[PDB]
Design a protein around this ligand. Structure first.
Ligand SMILES: *C/C=C(C)/C=C/C=C(C)/C=C/C1=C(C)CCCC1(C)C
Ligand SMILES: *C/C=C(C)/C=C/C=C(C)/C=C/C1=C(C)CCCC1(C)C
Ligand SMILES: *C/C=C(C)/C=C/C=C(C)/C=C/C1=C(C)CCCC1(C)C
Lengths: 228, 228, 228
C-alpha cells in the first residue's frame, strides 16, 4: 500500500514535472500556428500527469477496494490522468496526419470507453467481474490501434514525407507502450495480483514517462510539426 | 432493488451491444468524410449505453439514497450514460442541418444542465427538493426542444430536401421519446414512487433502445448523411 | 457551516438566475452567427453557476473535510461550477481576439489544472498539503494571465479597434477579479481559516456575480461581438 512504492511515485512526479517545464521553455520559441498546437497539446500531457502523480505520492489519489476477500489499495488517480492524457496523445497523432473529424471523434470516444471501463474494473467489488471490464477496455484499445494502422497509417503517406516517417515512429511507440498497460493491470494489484503493487507502480511509471515525455521529445524535435 | 429488474437490464445490455456491432460493421463500408462523422457519432452512442447498462446489470451503477424516510435504490449509471449520449444525439441532428457553432454550444450546454440537474435530483436527500431539480432539468429540456423546432427546423429546409425530411423525422422521434423521460422519472422510484423500480427500469430500457438504436437505424439508413 | 452564509447563497442564486434570464431574453434579438456564439457562451455561464449556487443553498454541494484537527465544511459545488464556467469565460475572450486553436487549448488545459488542483486542495486531509495544491493552482492561474497579456493583448490590436478596446476592458476585469479568488481561498475556511465561512461565502458571491454577470453585461452590450 501507500509506502514501499513511494519512490516510483516521487520519481514519476519529478520526471513529469521536469518534462513539462522543458516543453514549456522549448515552446517559448514558437510562432508557427500549427507548431503551437503540437506544443500546447504535448506540454499539457505531462502537466496533467504531474498533478496526478503528486496526488498519488501524497496519498490523495489512493483508495481501498474490497474484493477477492481483501481490502485492496487502488490508485484511482491514474484513470483521472489517462482520461485526459490519452485522448490528447491521440490528438497529436491525428493532427500530424490531418485526420478528419469523424475519425478523431471515433478515437476520442473509443479512448473514453477504454479508460472509463478500466476505472469501473479497478473499483469493482466482485473479483471475476473485474476481468469482464478489463476485456471490454482491451477491446476498445484494439479498436484504437486498428484505426491507427488501417485508418491512419494509410493517410500519413498521402501526406508529406517527414509527416509520414514521424507518424510511423510515434505510431510504433504508441502501439508498443499502450499494449503493455493491460498486461500490467492484469498481473498487478488491480487484476490477478501476481505482481506486488510496488512493482506494479514501477512498471506504470516507466510506461507513463516514456509514453508522455519520451513521446513528446520525439514529436517536438521533428520538423513534421511545422507547416513546411 | 437489484433483482426483479435484472431482465430489463440484461435485455438492454444485449440490445445496445448488438446495435453497436451492427453500426460498426455497417460503417466499415464508408469512405465519405461526412458520412463518417455520422457513423462515428451514432455508433459511439450505443457503445456507451452498452457499458452503463452492463454496470447496472452487474450492480456497479446502483446506489442507495435516503429520502422520504427510506433507503431508495438509485441507478446513477444512467446519468453518466446520458451525460455523453444525449449531446452526441443532438450533434447528429445539428450536423444534419449544418447548424452554426453558436447553436451547437447552446444545445450541448443546455443538455449538460439537464442531465447534471437530473443527477442532483436523483441523489438529493430531501424529498421535496428532488422535484425542484426535476423542474429545472425539465426547463432545460424544453429549451432544447424549442431550439430544435424554432432554431433548427427552419434551417433544415433552407438546405437539401432529403436533409429536411430526414431531420424532420428524427426531430419528431426525439421530441416524442425525450419528453417521456421526465414523466417516467416523476412517477418512478426517483420521484413520486407511484411506479415500482421494476417497471421504471423497463420503461427507460424501451425508451433508451428506441432513442439510440432506433434513432441510429433511421439516420444511418438515409442518404441525407452523404455529401450529395 | 450550512446556516449563517445562507443569505449570500440565496442572493447568489437569485442574481445568477436573473442574469441568465436577462441574457436569454436579450439574445432572442440575435441573427448574426458570431454574435450568437458570444450570447450562447455568455448565457451558459450564469446558468451553470445558478444551478451550483442553488445546490449549495439547499445543502447538496456541501461536504465535511477533516484536517488541521477539525471537521471543516467545504462547498465542493463551487469547483464543479468553475470547471465549466472559467473555460467558457476564457473562450469568450479568445473568440473576441480570434485566437488560434493552439492557444485556446493551452488556456482550457491550464484552466482545467487550476480548478482540478484547487479541488484536490479543498478536499485534502493533510493541512500543510492543502497549500501545495494552492500553489500549483496559482501557478496555473498566472500562466493564464500571462497568455492573456503576452499572447492575446498583442493580437486584439492587430484586429479591429472596437475588438481591441473591449478585449482590453474585459481582460482587465478578468485579471483583477480572478486574482482575488486565490487570496480568498487562502484566508478562508479552505486555507488558513483567518476569515469565517460566512464572510468567505460573501466574498466569492460578489466575485462570482461580477466575473459572470458583470462580465457578461460589458461584453453583450458592445459592438465588438458583431461581424462589423
Ligand atoms: C499517459 C498514459 C498513457 C499513454 C496510458 C495508456 C493506458 C492504457 C492504454 C490503458 C489500458 C487499459 C486496458 C486496455 C484494459 C485494463 C485497464 C487499462 C485502463 C489499464
Ligand atoms: C440515450 C438516452 C437519451 C436520449 C436520454 C434522454 C433523457 C432525457 C431527455 C432526460 C430528462 C430528464 C428530465 C427532463 C428531468 C428529470 C430527470 C431526467 C434526467 C430523467
Ligand atoms: C465564475 C467563476 C470564476 C471566474 C472563477 C474563478 C476562479 C479562480 C481564478 C480560482 C482560483 C484558485 C486558485 C488560483 C488557487 C486556489 C484555489 C482556487 C480554485 C480558488
Amino acid at each position: 500500500t501507500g509506502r514501499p512504492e513511494w519512490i516510483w511515485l516521487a520519481l514519476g512526479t519529478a520526471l513529469m514535472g521536469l518534462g513539462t517545464l522543458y516543453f514549456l521553455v522549448k515552446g517559448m520559441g514558437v510562432s508557427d500556428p500549427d507548431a503551437k498546437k503540437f506544443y500546447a497539446i504535448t506540454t499539457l500531457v505531462p502537466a496533467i500527469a504531474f498533478t496526478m502523480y503528486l496526488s498519488m505520492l501524497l496519498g490523495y489519489g489512493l483508495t481501498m477496494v474490497p474484493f477477492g476477500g481483501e481490502q485492496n489499495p487502488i490508485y484511482w488517480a491514474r484513470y483521472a490522468d489517462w482520461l485526459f492524457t490519452t485522448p490528447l496523445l491521440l490528438l497529436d497523432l491525428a493532427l500530424l496526419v490531418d485526420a478528419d473529424q469523424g475519425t478523431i471523434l471515433a478515437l476520442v470516444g473509443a479512448d473514453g470507453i477504454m479508460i472509463g471501463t478500466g476505472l469501473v474494473g479497478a473499483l469493482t467489488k466482485v473479483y471475476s467481474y473485474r476481468f469482464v471490464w478489463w476485456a471490454i477496455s482491451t477491446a476498445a484499445m484494439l479498436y484504437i490501434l486498428y484505426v491507427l494502422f488501417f485508418g491512419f497509417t494509410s493517410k500519413a503517406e498521402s501526406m508529406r514525407p517527414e509527416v509520414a516517417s514521424t507518424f510511423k515512429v510515434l505510431r510504433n511507440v504508441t502501439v508498443v507502450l499502450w499494449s503493455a498497460y493491460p498486461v500490467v493491470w492484469l498481473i498487478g494489484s488491480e487484476g490477478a495480483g501476481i505482481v506486488p503493487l510496488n512493482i506494479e507502480t514501477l512498471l506504470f511509471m516507466v510506461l507513463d514517462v516514456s509514453a508522455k515525455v519520451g513521446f513528446g521529445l520525439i514529436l517536438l524535435r521533428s520538423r513534421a510539426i511545422f507547416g513546411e
